[PDB]
Symmetry: D2
Subunit: 234 residues, 4 copies
C-alpha cells in the first residue's frame, strides 16, 4: 500500500533503477529519480534531479527534502584482475558504493523515524554470495554496504523501518547488452538454470514488494533474484 509515499531512486535514468521508478509510479507513489545524464532524465517522464554524488550531495538533499522509501543503486565499477586494478579503483568503488550511500541514509533516516514507517532497499548483486572472479571492486564494496545495512536493520527495526537488499543476477539492461558479445551472452545464458537473463521489471517487482506495506515483517535480508544461478542453499 504505497499510494502517495515519497520515493527516491538513485541511478535511475536507465536499467533496473529506471524500472523500479516506473513500477512505484504506476502504484501511485510520488517518485523522484536521479542520475548524471540530464537529457535521459528529461525524457524519462519522472521528477528528476541531476546529481553527481561525488561532487554535490547537498543539491540532492535540498531538492528532495523527505522520503518514505529510498532505493540505493549505482553504476557498476571497473572489472579486472588484481594486476590491472589500482588503489584508486578500490577507493572510488568504496566511496561511491559504500560511503556516499551511508551519507544518503543518514540524511533521510530521521524523517522516517519521526513518521514511524520507512523503507530502505539497496540494489546490489548476486555476485555478493557468488563472487565473480574479476569483480574485486564491487564484490568487496557491496559486502561492505550489505554489512552496514544488516547492522542498521537491527537499530531501525522498532521504528517501523525495514532495511533490505535485492541482489539481481544477470539482467538484460541496455548497459549489459553492450558490455557483452552475443557469444558471451549465450555462454552465460546457458549456465543460468532459467536459461535467460532477467527483464529489468523482474527485479523491479521484488524491490516494489519490499517497499509495500505487506513486507512489514521482512528486514535485514538480501533477496537474490538470479534465475537459480547461485549455488548457496540457505
Amino acid at each position: 500500500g504505497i499510494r502517495d509515499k515519497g520515493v527516491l531512486v538513485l541511478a535511475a535514468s536507465r536499467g533496473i533503477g529506471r524500472a523500479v521508478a516506473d513500477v512505484l509510479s504506476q502504484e501511485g507513489a510520488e517518485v523522484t529519480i536521479c542520475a548524471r545524464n540530464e537529457e535521459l532524465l528529461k525524457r524519462s517522464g519522472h521528477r528528476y534531479v541531476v546529481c553527481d554524488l561525488r561532487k554535490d550531495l547537498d543539491l540532492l538533499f535540498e531538492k528532495v527534502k523527505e522520503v518514505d522509501i529510498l532505493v540505493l543503486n549505482a553504476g557498476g565499477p571497473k572489472a579486472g584482475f588484481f594486476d590491472e586494478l589500482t588503489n584508486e579503483d578500490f577507493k572510488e568503488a568504496i566511496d561511491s558504493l559504500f560511503l556516499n550511500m551511508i551519507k544518503i541514509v543518514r540524511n533521510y533516516l530521521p524523517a522516517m523515524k519521526e513518521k514511524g514507517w520507512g523503507r530502505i532497499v539497496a540494489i546490489t548483486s548476486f555476485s555478493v554470495i557468488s563472487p565473480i572472479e574479476n569483480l574485486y571492486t564491487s564484490n568487496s564494496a557491496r559486502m561492505a554496504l550489505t554489512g552496514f545495512l544488516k547492522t542498521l536493520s537491527f537499530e531501525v527495526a522498532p521504528y517501523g523501518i525495514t532495511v533490505n537488499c535485492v541482489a539481481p543476477g544477470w539482467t538484460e539492461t541496455e548497459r549489459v547488452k553492450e558490455l557483452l558479445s552475443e557469444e558471451k551472452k549465450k555462454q552465460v545464458e546457458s549456465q543460468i538454470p532459467m536459461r535467460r537473463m532477467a527483464k529489468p521489471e523482474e527485479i523491479a517487482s521484488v524491490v516494489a514488494f519490499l517497499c509495500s506495506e505487506k513486507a512489514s515483517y521482512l528486514t535485514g535480508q538480501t533477496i537474490v533474484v538470479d534465475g537459480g544461478l547461485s549455488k548457496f542453499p540457505l
Copy 2:
C-alpha cells in the same frame, strides 16, 4: 497474476497455512487445503481434503488431481534436548517433513512441466539459518528439505517452475499462543528487533508474492521473514 490457478496448501486449517489459503483465495485462485481435523476444515470456508502427512497420501492425489501452485507446510515436531529424544522422533520428523513432501512434489510436478509454468513454496523456519537449541528434529529435517528443493530448483527452472522456501520467525499463530506463557512470550518478543511476533498474514503475503507471475526470476531461495532476529548477514 493468479486468478484461476489451481492451488494446494498443506497443514492449512489453522495458522500460516490457513492465512496463505485465505490470501490466494482473495486473489482469485482455486484453493484446496488439507489437514487432519475435518471439523476445522468444514468451518474454514475452503475446498478441503482430510489428509495426514505422517501416513498415506493417495486420497490426496485422487481428490486433488493437478495443481499450478503447491505450498508445502507441516506441523512442528517434538522439541527437546538430545537425551529426551528417541530415534523414533528423528524418523517421524524425517518422514513427515522430508520424505512425504518429496512424494507430493513428485506427484504434482509433471503437470506443471506440461503447462510450462509452476510454483513450489515450502514453509520452513528461521531456525534453519539460526538454529534454536532444542529443535534437533525440525532443524535437521528442514535442512534436508531445503537441500532437496535447492537441488530441484536447478532442474525445473527451464520449465517455468520456481522453487523457494519462506522461513518465518516467531508468528502469532493460535498454536504458539498456547505453547507459551506470557513471561516466555515477552522475553522472546524483546529479542526481536521489531519487538513483536508476525501476524500470520505477514508471512502469507510473502508466500503469495512468490506464487505470483511477478516472482518469475526468483528461484532456489529461502526468504527469511523474521522481524530482523537472525544475525546472518547474507
Copy 3:
C-alpha cells in the same frame, strides 16, 4: 596431542577415511576402522571391524566399546535427475547418511562426557554449500546431518567435546578415478582454481587437526577443503 586416544573411523578401508586412519595412527592414536570389505580391511594393517551402515550396528558397539574421537564417513549415494530416483533412493540415503550416524553418536557420546573431552568429525561434501545438480540424495542427507551436528555442538560444548564437519571437494580417491573418464576429469580439474583434485591426505590433515588438542575452541563449523571451488564468501 593425541597419543593414546581411542579413535573410530567409518568407511575407512579406502579413500579419505583410510587416509584419516593412517594419519591418526602415525600420531600415536589407537585406531579402529570399519567397512564392508573384510579382505581390504585385513590388508589395511589396522585394527578393524566389518560393518554395513544399514544392518550391523550392535556388532560395532560390541567390538569397539569406547572412543575419544569419532570420524563419521560413508559411501556416496546414487547420483541422478529427479525422475530417475525413487523414494527408496532418498530413504536409503537418509538412513545411512543421517539416522544411522545419529545412532552411532548417541552410543559413543556418554563416555566422552564422562571424560570431559571429545571429538566428533563428519566428512561430508563441499556440495553442502555448493550443491551439484544431480546429487539430490546426498545434498539433502548431508544437510540433514550438518544441521543435526550444529544443534548438537551447542549442547556438548561445555563438556569439552567439539563437533565439526570437513567438506572435501574433488578428491583423487581410487573410487573417483573410476567414476570418471579422463575427459570428465580434466573438465572438472580446469574449474578448480588450484587446477587439481586433492590427494586424500590433504583432507585427512584437516580432519587430524580438528581431532587434536589444538582445535579446542573450534566447534559447530564445516571446514570446506576444495581448492577454492565453492563461491560462497563467508
Copy 4:
C-alpha cells in the same frame, strides 16, 4: 612444515597477533612483527618494525623485503550506534582494515607467485557472520576485506598460494580484559556454549595450521573459532 619460511604479522605486539608470531617462531619460521608501540616491540623478543601504516608502508616494505607467509591483522575500530558514528569513523575503518591491507598484499604477492608457494591469512572476527549490533564500522570493513580475499583466492590458487580468514570469537586479550567489566564479561561468557573466552593461543594454533604445508588444499575460507557462539549452520 614451515622451518625457515619468512613471516610477517601485523598488529602483533600484543593479543592474537602476538600469539601467532610466538607459535610460528617456535616452529622455526623467521618472523617479523609490526606495530605502533616500540617499547612493547623491543620487549617482545622478536624481529620488529615500528609503523603507523597510514604513513609507513614505505618503511615496512623497505625493512621487510619478501615474505612467504603474511598474517593481516589490525586494531579494532570505534564501536557505536549509528548516531554516534561519523563519516570519518567509517572512512578510517575502511582505510585501515581494507584499503591498506590490499596495498600490503599487492606488495608481498609477486615474490610468492615467483616461488610457487605462499600463505595469506587475515584475522577478522566472528562478527562477520554473526554481526554485533554496535560494530557498524568493523562489520562492514571486515566484510569488504573478506570479499576481497575470496575474490583473490581464485586467482592466486594455481600459484600455490592459499588465502584464508580466521574469525575469532571472544578472546581473552589484555585489550578485552580492559574494555569490559566483570559483570559484562560473565554475561558474555554465559552465552558462549564453551562457557569461556579463547586463550589467544587457541586462535593462534588455527592460524598456524593454515600457514603449514598441510593446509595445501584449503583456500577461500573463513574459519570461525568462537567456542560455538555463532548460529550459522553451514
